[PDB]
Structure 1
Amino acid sequence: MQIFVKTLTGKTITLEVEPSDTIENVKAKIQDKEGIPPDQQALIFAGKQLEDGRTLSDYNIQKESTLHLVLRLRGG
């Protein structure tokens, strides 16, 4: 199974996963492929924000699905 996470800057990042993966896993993947520190990553699917610890299958993100990732930082 493979999914794509798309960004606001336009780029489409492709990831290898399976549903028993958590989202801890997915942001680690994205960090390995794009150098994106995991605490800066906010992942959204079908409008809903995904939470660390819970798995990919729990949110019913299936094969070829598209997640969206935005950078979210504290100010200052």
Structure 2
Amino acid sequence: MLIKVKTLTGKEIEIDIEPTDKVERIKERVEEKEGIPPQQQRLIYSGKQMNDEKTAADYKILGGSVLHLVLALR
């Protein structure tokens, strides 16, 4: 399942995931291509901060779905 992860400055990245994949894995995919540690990532879908322990299916994510990535300093 190909989804988009968009940032405020406009750049997008395609991430391949599955309905059973946990949000933590999505962050790990972003880390693979961007080098941003999962702990510094905040993924938002439909105005909701995505929980690391939950799965893509819990947010009803489909092909083409756009997630929003923002930095969260720790």
Check whether TM > 0.5.
yes
Structure 2 matches for 1:1-76, cutoff 5 A? 1-74=1-74
Task: Compute the RMSD of aligned alpha carbons.
Answer: 0.8
Structure 1 residue ranges, 4+ long, deviating more than 6 angstroms after superposition: none
Matches of 1:15 and 1:32, distance apart in 2: 10
Mapped partners of 1:16, 1:50: distance in 2? 17
Higher CA-based Rg: 1
TM-score normalised by L of structure 2: 0.95
Higher helix proportion: 2
Identity among equivalent pairs (%): 55
What SS does structure 1 have at the residue aligned with 2:58?
coil
Give structure 2 stretches of 5+ with no counterpart: none
TM-superposed deviation, 1:10 = 1.6
SS of residue paired to 1:27: helix
Post-superposition shift, 1:9?
Answer: 2.3
Aligned residues: 74
